[PDB]
C-alpha cells in the first residue's frame, strides 16, 4: 500500500486525538510516567471513498493490512507503545477514522527546585515522517483529546491535558517531520508532609536549643550530638520523600541550613564551656542567654529569605 | 468478519463472568495487585446457527478466527491482559460460548485511613465498545462468576467476589460504552502488628517516662534523647510495615502524637533541671510527680479521642 | 483438529510427567519460586495408529499443527509457561510420546511458623478441562517423574520431588476438569543462623544484664538503652534474613521476648536507683542481687517454654 | 534472498548513521545506558534497479521481507535492540535506504576514579559480518550522525554524539567483520554534591576537634566517638551518592582519610587523658594545645595532596 | 525435514563452538551471570551434499525452516536463549557450518568460603537429546571456542575461557544425552576492600581497647558499646560488600570473632570496676594492664589461625 495521492501541492493532514483512560506509576527519580490511552488519528484517502446508496451501507470497516495507514510514533517513550487496533471506518468521502489502544512509560523531565509544592507539566510527544510521494502534517481534533474522570496518579493533583494545536514542523535527515506536544499538568498533594517530615525534623532541632538553658558540657554535648545523630536517622528514616536531585531543592536547602545550626550550636556549647573553665563565666552567661533568642530568630529570618528566594 | 445484524433495533447482549484461578503480588505501595482467572463470554449470532438433525451434532467448536468475536477490554489494567482462548462453542440457536484464560495486573486505589484494621474492595472493570453497525451491552452471568476455595492473599482474608449487574453505559469520543464493575472485598489480617510494631514501639516510649522517677539531668537527657533515636531506629526497622500515604492514617497520627510526646518529656526534664539550679526544687518536684501521671493518662484519653475519630 | 473418539464411554487417559532441569529464585516474601523442567505427556489416539511392515518405521514424528494435542495448563502459574516442543512420536498403536521442555514462576505458599528450622513442600498443579465430545482424565507415569542431581535450591536442601497419583476430578464451570499434585519437598540448610544472627543478638542482651553488677545509675541507663539501640541496629542489619509474617513465628516470639527482657531490666534500673535515693539500700541491693540470677534463669525457661510450643 | 552481486571484487559498503532520539536510565553500578534511535543504512543492489518511465515512480518502496538487507547487529548491547523499520526507498539506480528506529540497553565501562567530577566516554559499536559471496564493509555517513536538543541525562551535561569514521575491519571464526565506533561524550554535573554530602560531613569532622578545647574524658569519648557513629550514619544516607567502585576513587581516598583522622582524634583523647591521670598536665596540655592547629593544617595538606595526585 | 541417515551405526557428531562477545551481570547473591555470545555448530549431512562442477558454486546458503538442525539446548540457563541466526552454508560433501548469535542469563553457583579472595568456574552446559532414528553425541571445535579481548566482568579478572573436550553421555527418560562443559575462570579483583571495609572496621575496635587505659566505668562503657553500634552501622554500610552466603566464610568468621571480641572486652570493663568497688585495686589494675597486651595478641595470633584455615 502507498499513501493518498494530493489534488495539488498540499500536504496531508492527520488530526490526532490522545485520551488518557489510565495514568499511573510515576517514578520520580527514573523521571518517567506510564500511561494506558486512546489515540484516534483521521485522515482523507480518496481511493477509499464510496457511493453509499450503490454499497448500500454508510461506512466501511476494513483491517490495518488492508488501507494505508500512517506510520505515527511517540518520541518520549521508553520502547514502542502496547497498541491494539480497536476499530477503523471509512466514510463515503474517503475520511478513515483509525483508532487503537496503548500503554506506555513516557519519558518527562521533573523540577524538583520548589518540592514539595512542585506542580509539573508532563509531555507527550506525537510525531509523523513525511514520505517521498507527499508531506505530512499532524493536528488535533479537540472533540477527541481528554481524560477519564477516575484517572488518578497518587500523591498529586491532576490539573489538565490539553494539546499544543500548532505542530512543530522541521527538517531531519534530508525529511519533514510534523511533532505534536500533549501536555499532561500535575500540581503536588502532600499533606502530610509537615506531620510526617517537617514537624518531628524541627522538634529534633529545638530539643538541641535546650542547651541554651543548661550549664552542664556533658549534658550539652550529648543534647546537641545526639539531636544531630537523631537528625541523621530521621533523614534515612524520611529519605524516599527527600528528592533526588542534582541542583538545589527548597527542602534540600533547608536541610543544609539545619546542618550549620547543629555545627553553630557546637561552637556556643564549646565556647561557653571554655569561657567557665577560663574563670569567666560573666561572657559565658552573656552568649548563651543571647543564643536564646538569637537561635530561633536567625531561624526563623533565614526560613523568610529562602521561602522568598523559591516563591 | 462482521458483528451479527439485528433482528429490530435491539443491542447485542454480551453475557460476561470472571471466574478467579489465582490472586497474588498486591502491592500497597503501587496499587496494584495481580490476578490470574478465567472470562467467559456468550452472544447470539443466528448466522452460526445450525439444525442439530441435517448437522448431525449438538455442538460446534470454532478457531477465534473462524467467527465474529467482540473486543472486550479491562479499563484499569497496566498492560494488555495475557489471554489464551481455552473453548468457543456454538449451540443450535447461534449462540456463542466463548471461554479463555487470562492473567492481569489490576489498578485498583486503597484507602490506608484504618490501616492495620483497613477493608479494602478491589476492582476489575470490563468495557466493550460499540460499533456503527450495532450497539454493543454488557450483562452478567452470575452462574459464571465465582473465586476457586485455595484463592489466597498473603496477610488479608479475601470476603466476597461478587459483581454489578447493572453495566455503565456512557458515550466515549462519539461512540458507545458498556462497563461493568467486579469487586473483590479483602480484609486486612495482621494479628502480629500489635508484638511487631505496637508493642516495642510503646516500650520504648515508657522508658523514656522512667525519666519522672530520676533527678540527674544528665540520666535524663540520655532516657529521652537516646529512646528518641531508638524510636526512629525502631521506625527504619519496621518501616516496610509502615502505610506510604499522602492523606492522615491511623497509625500515621498515633506515630506523629508519639514524637510530640517525646518533646513535651524533653521539656518537662529541662523545666525540672532549670527550677532545681534556680534554686526552686519544690515546684520542680511537683512538676515530676505531676508527670508520672499526665504523661500516662494524656497518652490513654488522647489514643481514644484517635480512635474514636478513625472508627 | 478434534480430539479422538473414544470405543466406549469411557474418558481419555494422558499420562503425565514432570522431570526438575534447574530449581531457582525461591522468594520467600512473594512466595514463588521458578522452575526449569521437562513435561512429559502420553495418549492413545487411534486415528493415528499405523502397520509397522508397510509403513517401513517403527515410530512416525509429528509436528504439533499436524496432531491434536491436549491443552494441559498449570493452575499455581504467574503467567503463561514459556514452553518449546522437544519432541512428538507415535507408536504403531496410535500411543503419542509429546515432550516438551518449559519454565515457570510457581505460586506455593510457605510456613514461616517454624523459621529458620522450617520445611515445605512447594506444589506444581496440572489441570486439563474436559471437551464436549469426550472428557479428559490425567495420570501419573512414575517412571516419567523425577529431578537432575545437580538441582540445588541455595538456602534448602531439595529432600524429594514426587506426585499424588490419584487426580483430583471436580465441575467447573459446567465441565470437568482433572487437576495434579507435584510435591517439591525442601528443608532449611541455614546453619550459620546460629553464628550470625543468635549469637551476637544474645552477646548485645548480655551486655545489658552487667547493670545488676553496677550501682551507677549513669552507666546503667547507658547500658541498658544503648545495648537497646544495638538490638535494633543489629536487626536492621540481619532484617534481610529474618522471616516476613502476618502471624507468630518462632524467630519472631524470642525477638518479642527480647525486647521484654529490655523493658524489665530498665524497671530493675530504675527501681535500685530510686530505692538508693530514698534511703533504702538494704532492697535496692537485695533486687540487684536478686536479678543476676533471676534475669538469665527466666530467660531459659521462658525459651525452652516457647521452644517446646513451637515444636 | 542472497547478497548483491561485486562488479569487481570490491566489497559492499554500508553507510551507517546514529541519529539518538531518546538518552536515559544510565546506572553507574551496572555501567550501561539504555537509548532510543534512528539506525540509517545504505548500500547499492543493482537487482534492484527500474525505470521511472516504465513504473511511474521515482522511488520505489519495499518491505524488509521483500529485499537483500544485511545483518547489522550490535557488540556491547545486553539483549537484541527493539528495532521498527520506518522506511526502504530504492532509487533508480539501486541504492537502497534502510531506516529504523531502535531502543537498546548499552554496556560502556565507567571511570569513577575522579568522581563527582568525572567525564565518559559511552560507546556504541555497529558490526557487520562478511558472507561467503562477497566481502560487506561499514561506513559512517557524517549527514546523518547526530542528536535531538532535547536530549538529556540527568545528572550529566551531554557533550557530544561523533563516530570514529575508520571502521576497524578484523578476521573472526575464519570470515571477515567491519566494526565501527559511535561516541557519546559526558561530564557529571553534580553542584548539590557540597552541600548535600562534602559539607555536612565536614561539619561533622569540626564537631570532634572540639575536643582540643575540652579536658573532660568523659564529654571528649562522647564528642569523637558519636561523630564517628554520625560520620557512618551519614554514609548510610548519602550511600546512594557514593560510587561503588573496586579501584581507589578521589572520594573513596577522602573518606578513608577521614576515617583515620577519627582514629588519631581518639589516640590524642587517650594520652591527654593518660598524662593527666598520670598527674603529668604540662605535656597533656602541649599536646592537646598542639593538636588544634595540627589536626586542621595536616587535614586541609592532605587534601590538596589528594586532589593533586587525582588531578 | 528427519535427521541424516547413517552410513552404519554410528552416531552423528556436531562440532560446537561457543566465543564470548559480551559478559556482564554477575549477580553474586543470584548465583547467575548474563552473557552474549556466537554458537557455531558443524556436522555432516550427506543428503546435502552437491557436486561443485554440475552446481556452478561451493557453498549453498540455507534458511532454517529449509534444512535439519540439531535441536542444541543450554541447561544451565534461567529461560530459553535469545538466540538469532547469522549464517548456515553447507560445503559439497554436505559439511553444514551453522552459527548463531545468542544471549542467555546463566546459573553458575558460587563459593565465597575464600571470599574477597575467591575464584570461579562458571559453567555453560551444552546438551543436545538423541532422536529414535539416529543418536546425536556433542564435539568440541578448538579452533571456534575463545572470547573478545574487551570482554569485562567488573570486579574481577577473566582468566579462561576453554571447554572440556570429552562430552557427558548418559541416559535420560530413554533417551541418550551427550552433554558439554564450557567453563569460565574468573578471580576476583578487590583491591579497595582493605582501605573500605576491613581498616575502618578494625579501627572501631582498636578504639574499644583505650578502654584498657582508662578507670572511668562511665567512659568505658560509653567506649565499650558505642564502638559495637559503631560497629553495627558500618556493617549496615558495607553490608552490600559482604557475602550473602549461609556456610562459614573467611571474612564470616572475622566478623564473627570481632562480635566475641567486643563481649570480652565488657566484661573485662565490669570486672575491672566490681574488683574497684570491692576495694581490691590490686587486682584491677593487673587485668586491666593484662588486657593491653592479651587483646591485641589474642587477636592477631586468631586472625593467623583463620588465615591457615582458610587458605
Ligand atoms: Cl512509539
Ligand atoms: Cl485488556
Ligand atoms: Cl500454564
Ligand atoms: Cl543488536
Ligand atoms: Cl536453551
Ligand atoms: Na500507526
Ligand atoms: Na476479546
Ligand atoms: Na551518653
Ligand atoms: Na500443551
Ligand atoms: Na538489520
Ligand atoms: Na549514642
Ligand atoms: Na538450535
Known amino acids: 500500500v502507498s499513501p493518498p495521492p494530493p489534488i495539488a501541492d498540499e500536504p496531508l493532514t492527520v488530526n490526532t486525538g490522545i485520551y488518557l483512560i489510565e495514568s499511573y506509576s510515576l517514578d520520580d527519580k527514573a523521571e518517567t510516567f506510564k500511561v494506558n490511552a486512546f489515540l484516534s488519528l483521521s485522515w482523507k484517502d480518496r481511493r477509499l ?39 477503523i471506518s471509512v466514510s463515503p468521502d474517503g475520511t478513515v477514522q483509525y483508532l487503537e489502544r496503548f500503554s506506555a512509560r513516557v519519558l518527562s523531565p521533573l523540577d524538583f527546585r520548589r518540592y514539595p509544592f512542585d506542580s509539573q507539566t508532563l509531555h507527550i510527544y506525537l510525531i509523523v515522517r513525511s514520505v517521498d510521494t507527499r508531506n505530512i502534517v ?13 484517572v488518578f496518579l497518587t500523591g498529586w493533583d491532576i490539573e489538565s491535558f490539553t494539546a499544543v494545536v500548532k505542530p512543530a514542523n522541521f527538517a531531519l535527515e534530508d525529511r519533514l517531520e510534523s511533532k505534536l506536544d500533549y ?25 538541641s536549643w535546650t542547651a541554651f538553658w543548661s550549664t552542664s558540657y556533658e ?13 541523621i536517622a530521621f533523614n534515612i528514616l524520611v529519605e524516599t520523600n527527600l528528592p533526588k536531585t542534582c541542583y538545589m531543592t527548597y527542602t534540600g536547602a533547608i536541610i543544609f541550613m539545619i546542618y550549620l545550626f547543629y555545627f553553630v550550636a557546637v ?45
Open 49 to 87: 471513498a464510496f457511493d453509499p446508496v450503490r454499497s448500500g451501507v454508510r461506512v466501511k470497516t476494513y483491517e490495518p493490512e488492508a488501507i494505508w495507514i500512517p506510520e505515527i510514533r511517540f518520541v518520549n517513550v521508553e520502547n514502542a507503545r502496547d497498541a491494539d487496533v480497536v476499530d
Open 138 to 150: 499532524l493536528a488535533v481534533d479537540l472533540e477527541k483529546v481528554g481524560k477519564n474522570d477516575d
Open 183 to 207: 501536555q499532561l499538568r500535575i500540581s503536588r498533594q502532600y499533606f502530610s508532609f509537615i506531620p510526617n517530615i517537617i514537624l518531628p525534623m524541627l522538634f529534633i532541632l529545638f530539643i
Open 219 to 231: 549534658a550539652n554535648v550529648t543534647l546537641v550530638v545526639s539531636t544531630l545523630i537523631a537528625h
Open 267 to 311: 561552637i556556643e556549647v564549646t565556647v561557653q564551656h571554655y569561657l567557665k573553665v577560663e574563670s569567666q563565666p560573666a561572657r559565658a552567661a552573656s552568649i548563651t542567654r543571647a543564643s536564646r533568642i538569637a537561635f530561633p530568630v536567625v531561624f526563623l529570618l533565614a526560613n523568610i529569605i529562602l521561602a522568598f528566594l523559591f516563591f
